[PDB]
Amino acid sequence: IAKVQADEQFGIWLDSSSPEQTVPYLWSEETPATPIGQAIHRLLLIQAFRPDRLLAMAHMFVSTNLGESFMSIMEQPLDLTHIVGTEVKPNTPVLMCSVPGYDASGHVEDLAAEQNTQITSIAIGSAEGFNQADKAINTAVKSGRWVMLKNVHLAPGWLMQLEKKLHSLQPHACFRLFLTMEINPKVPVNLLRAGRIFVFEPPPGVKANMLRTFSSIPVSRICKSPNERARLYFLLAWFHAIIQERLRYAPLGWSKKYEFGESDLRSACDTVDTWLDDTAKGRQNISPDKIPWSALKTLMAQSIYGGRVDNEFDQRLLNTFLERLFTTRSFDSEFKLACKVDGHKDIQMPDGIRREEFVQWVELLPDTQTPSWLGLPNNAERVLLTTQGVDMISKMLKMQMLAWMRTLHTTASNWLHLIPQTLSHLKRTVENIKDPLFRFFEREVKMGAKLLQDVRQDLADVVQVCEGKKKQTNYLRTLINELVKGILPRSWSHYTVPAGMTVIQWVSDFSERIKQLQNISLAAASGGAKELKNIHVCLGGLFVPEAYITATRQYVAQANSWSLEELCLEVNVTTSQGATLDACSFGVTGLKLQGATCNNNKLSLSNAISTALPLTQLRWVKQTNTEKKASVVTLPVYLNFTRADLIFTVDFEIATKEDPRSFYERGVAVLCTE
């Protein structure tokens, strides 16, 4: 901490693109540390300072320990020849697992072609398929023939029988079995244990995605008249690549990882073919105006791709892509597929009108893809990298788990000391019962106190059993296993929490929530009912924040005698500390803005990870039939950073000249908690 203030050149390293390459010396030690010690110390420094570059520091730490070229052989493409001809027993099935949506049979086909060894390929999933597979295997055992069995993941039982058969065989040296498949938990463990597993992931990259798409589509199908079909297919392939790559950066890109696969690609291609044939009537060329852009946009937004989209905002984002790409302006020579790649360069549409020119253009894409290609902000890569670093640390920690009574006892004692003791229930008064805010806060404090007593009793009993003074009941053993292994107990899950959340984070947030509830209860006791309206409550702290929004609406409707269905929410962000609250305004704290900054209640795009709103004020005003302005954008307010729970949709106004389409594409949203 002292060295942080004493270094003036810290900013140039902290904001550097690759800080992990040159980590300045910031540790105090008695003797000059060895290079491995320097590597581990710099790894800790990067983890604390720039967690996004944790993977990059990790690679050099591995290079320092195990040699630079330790990870080099992974980067090179897999060589089937030596691995199949040698170091694989003929009775060991080669399990070619692949991520769903990507095949791996072509690699083996090329291997067999190069090795000039004849091979048969068999589909799996039908009875005659099983019979043909058995016959081909039996023929191959006595003839040294290679056998493919495609999509064996569909029949786990037949997989168990096939593994049992392969155990009791006398295979010929030239014989080899190739089981291509997809990642699926239904497959037997015995087959995986007795085979040389190979994982074939699709190579990331928009360019790689469009090369895969263009190779999948036959050249004859694209070459069909009119020649506008080639450009339509290129637009469709670009759109598919954009959404498939955007799936990776989740939940910023897509609110959840949808299954945008090859089936949607084929359906979209069929739709384009049918509608272009209908409109063209066989003419060699058609004007871009005459192309049914509206039909393609509607079908690709509602049925082909939007069928799997459930969230409304994801549907809006898909609509933005489809309206930006599929338009008559796309055939112009200066059409920009992506804007603001690095702030200056913009990707332009190739001028060619033939499939070969489109393939030549896509092969010429620079191998410097950034999230700005997808419309995402440039810091999305940093978020993904830091998420991967956290996951990698968690993975190694689970690895290192393979005596504990004292550790569990002291952890539980610290937790009990940290967690507050009691919650006082709100007193029911005949005057207070009519207040909707009082009713909501009463429900909150009652259920929170129930949870608090439950958790405290469980923790105290855990402390006692860790002292060897109480018996272990079934609930107790289950809870002890959950706490030891780190999984959040199912009993302490009466309110929504982010998925994959460790117990310690849950305890911290639980203590924060009970502190907030203690403050609310004290204020309610002191003021009765007036103070509950003028309290600044964090929407993240509340267990059911949508119930809080409903309570605010009910209170505004009752106080002003307006009907509840004639109220709309207006959001004003005030930076002043302790700003005055109107009779129909409620303070909100803790709201975090993602991908934008709000100044004078007016959004502006920013590259920061997140921006904290000082004091959000929710006002309920009478509904007005005035049309929404063109500079007004609707932002979701997700409960947590997973963007899996929607609570309410606020409205905000755009600053200067900023396109709301960019706001939709950048994933701008409000989070109750960070």
Partner 1 sequence: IFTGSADIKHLLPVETQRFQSISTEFLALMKKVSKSPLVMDVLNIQGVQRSLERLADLLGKIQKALGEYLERERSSFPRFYFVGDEDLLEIIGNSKNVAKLQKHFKKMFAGVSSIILNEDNSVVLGISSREGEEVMFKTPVSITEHPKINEWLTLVEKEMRVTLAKLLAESVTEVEIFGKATSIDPNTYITWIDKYQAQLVVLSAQIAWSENVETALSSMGGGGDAAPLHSVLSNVEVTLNVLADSVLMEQPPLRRRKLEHLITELVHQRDVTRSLIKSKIDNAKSFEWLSQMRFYFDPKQTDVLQQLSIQMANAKFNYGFEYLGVQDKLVQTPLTDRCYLTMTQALEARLGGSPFGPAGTGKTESVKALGHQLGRFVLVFNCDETFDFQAMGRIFVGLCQVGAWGCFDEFNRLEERMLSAVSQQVQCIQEALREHSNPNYDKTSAPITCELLNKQVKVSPDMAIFITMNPGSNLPDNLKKLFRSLAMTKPDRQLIAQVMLYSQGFRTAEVLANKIVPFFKLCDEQLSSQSHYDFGLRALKSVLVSAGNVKRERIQKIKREKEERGEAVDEGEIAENLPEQEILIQSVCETMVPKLVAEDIPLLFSLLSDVFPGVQYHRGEMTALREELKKVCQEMYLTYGDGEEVGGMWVEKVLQLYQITQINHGLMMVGPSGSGKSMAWRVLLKALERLEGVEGVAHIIDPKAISKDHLYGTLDPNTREWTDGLFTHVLRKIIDSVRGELQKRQWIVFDGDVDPEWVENLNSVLDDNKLLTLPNGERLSLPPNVRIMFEVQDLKYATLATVSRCGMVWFSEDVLSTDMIFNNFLARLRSIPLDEGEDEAQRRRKGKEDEGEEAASPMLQIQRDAATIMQPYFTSNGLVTKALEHAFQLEHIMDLTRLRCLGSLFSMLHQACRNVAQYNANHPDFPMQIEQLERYIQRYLVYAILWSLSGDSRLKMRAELGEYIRRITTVPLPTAPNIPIIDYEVSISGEWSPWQAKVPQIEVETHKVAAPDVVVPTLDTVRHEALLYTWLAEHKPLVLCGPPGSGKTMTLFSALRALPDMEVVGLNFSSATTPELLLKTFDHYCEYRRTPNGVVLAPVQLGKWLVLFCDEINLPDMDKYGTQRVISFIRQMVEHGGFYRTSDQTWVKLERIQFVGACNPPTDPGRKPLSHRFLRHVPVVYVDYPGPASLTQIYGTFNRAMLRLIPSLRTYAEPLTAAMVEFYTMSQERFTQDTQPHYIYSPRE
User: Which of 565, 534, 537, 582 lies closest to 435, judged by CA?
Assistant: 534
Q: Smaller CB distance to partner 1: residue 465 or 503?
A: 465
**Residue 546 binding partner 1, by CB under 8 A:** yes
Among 225, 298, 379, 508, binds partner 1 (CB under 8 A): 298
Q: What x-and-dash track marks residues 184-223 binding partner 1 by CB under 8 A?
A: x---------------------------------------
Pairing of strands 585-589, 616-622: antiparallel
CB 190 within 8 A of CB 156: no
Q: What gap in Å lies between CA 530 and CA 437, rounded to an integer?
A: 10
Q: What gap in Å lies between CA 170 and CA 142, rounded to an integer?
A: 9
Among 105, 117, 121, 550, binds partner 1 (CB under 8 A): 550
Strands (DSSP E) contained in 99-144 are 119-123
**Residue 257 binding partner 1, by CB under 8 A:** no
Q: What gap in Å lies between CA 442 and CA 426, rounded to an integer?
A: 6
The secondary structure of 249-305, three-state, reads: CCCCCCCCCCCCCHHHHHHHHHHHHHHHHHHHCCCCCCCHHHCCHHHHHHHHHHHHC
Q: Smaller CB distance to partner 1: residue 123 or 579?
A: 123
Sign of CA dihedral 583, 588, 594, 598: positive
Q: What x-and-dash track marks residues 147-186 binding partner 1 by CB under 8 A?
A: ------xx---------------------------x-x--
Among 108, 252, 291, 304, binds partner 1 (CB under 8 A): 304
Rounded (10°) angle between helices 355-363 and 228-246: 30
What burial class does residue 143 get, using C-beta atoms within 10 Å of its C-beta: 0-12 exposed, 13-18 middle, 19+ buried?
exposed
Pairing of strands 596-598, 347-348: unpaired
Structure-token pair, residue 165: 């058969």
Q: Footprint of partner 1 on residues 216-255 (CB under 8 A)?
A: none
Q: Considering only 190-198, 262-270, 520-528, 534-542, which stretch makes contact with partner 1 by CB under 8 A? A: 262-270
**Residue 302 binding partner 1, by CB under 8 A:** yes
Provide the minimum distance between the beta carbon of 96 and partner 1 in the complex, in angstroms, as a whole number. Answer: 17
Among 209, 244, 320, 554, binds partner 1 (CB under 8 A): 554
Q: Smaller CB distance to partner 1: residue 415 or 438?
A: 438
Q: Smaller CB distance to partner 1: residue 183 or 504?
A: 183
Q: What x-and-dash track marks residues 567-606 binding partner 1 by CB under 8 A?
A: ----------------------------------------
Q: Smaller CB distance to partner 1: residue 37 or 307?
A: 307
User: Which of 512, 534, 531 lies closest to 522, judged by CA?
Assistant: 531
Strands (DSSP E) contained in 168-226 are 176-182, 198-200
CB 463 within 8 A of CB 412: yes
Q: Smaller CB distance to partner 1: residue 10 or 275?
A: 275
Q: What x-and-dash track marks residues 611-630 binding partner 1 by CB under 8 A?
A: --------------------
Beta bridge partners of 177: 147
**Residue 295 binding partner 1, by CB under 8 A:** yes
**Residue 45 binding partner 1, by CB under 8 A:** no
Q: Footprint of partner 1 on residues 445-504 (CB under 8 A)?
A: 471
Among 132, 225, 558, 642, binds partner 1 (CB under 8 A): 558
Q: What gap in Å lies between CA 460 and CA 287, rounded to an integer?
A: 77
Structure-token pair, residue 373: 């290609």
Q: Smaller CB distance to partner 1: residue 13 or 275?
A: 275
Q: How far apart, in Å, are the Cα atoms of 553 and each of 431, 533, 586, 588, 620?
A: 19, 12, 10, 14, 7
Provide the minimum distance between the beta carbon of 271 and partner 1 in the complex, in angstroms, as a whole number. Answer: 8
Among 236, 299, 437, 639, binds partner 1 (CB under 8 A): 299
In angstroms and rounded to an integer, the radius of gyration of the C-alpha atoms of the chain is: 31
Q: Considering only 34-42, 73-81, 142-150, 291-299, which stretch makes contact with partner 1 by CB under 8 A? A: 291-299
Provide the minimum distance between the beta carbon of 469 and partner 1 in the complex, in angstroms, as a whole number. Answer: 9
**Residue 529 binding partner 1, by CB under 8 A:** no
Q: Considering only 6-14, 49-57, 270-278, 418-426, which stretch makes contact with partner 1 by CB under 8 A? A: 270-278
Structure-token pair, residue 594: 């993602």
Provide the minimum distance between the beta carbon of 344 and partner 1 in the complex, in angstroms, as a whole number. Answer: 38
How many residues lie near partner 1 (CB under 8 A)?
45
CB 281 within 8 A of CB 341: no
Q: Footprint of partner 1 on residues 75-134 (CB under 8 A)?
A: 125-126
CB 296 within 8 A of CB 271: yes
Q: How far apart, in Å, are the Cα atoms of 71 and each of 41, 63, 79, 200, 206?
A: 21, 8, 16, 17, 24
Full strand arrangement of the beta sheet holding 119-123: 119-123, 146-150, 176-182, 94-98, 198-200
Q: What gap in Å lies between CA 422 and CA 28, rounded to an integer?
A: 44
CB 607 within 8 A of CB 342: no
Q: Footprint of partner 1 on residues 636-665 (CB under 8 A)?
A: none
Q: What x-and-dash track marks residues 306-345 binding partner 1 by CB under 8 A?
A: xxxxxxx---------------------------------
Provide the minimum distance between the beta carbon of 350 and partner 1 in the complex, in angstroms, as a whole number. Answer: 28
**Residue 270 binding partner 1, by CB under 8 A:** yes
Provide the minimum distance between the beta carbon of 285 and partner 1 in the complex, in angstroms, as a whole number. Answer: 20
φ, ψ of residue 98 to 5 degrees: the values are -140, 155
Q: Smaller CB distance to partner 1: residue 554 or 611?
A: 554
Q: Smaller CB distance to partner 1: residue 59 or 256?
A: 256
Enumerate binding residues for partner 1 (CB under 8 A).
125-126, 153-154, 182, 184, 259, 263, 267, 270-271, 274-275, 278, 292, 294-295, 298-299, 302-304, 306-312, 433-434, 436, 439, 471, 546-547, 550, 554, 557-558, 561-565
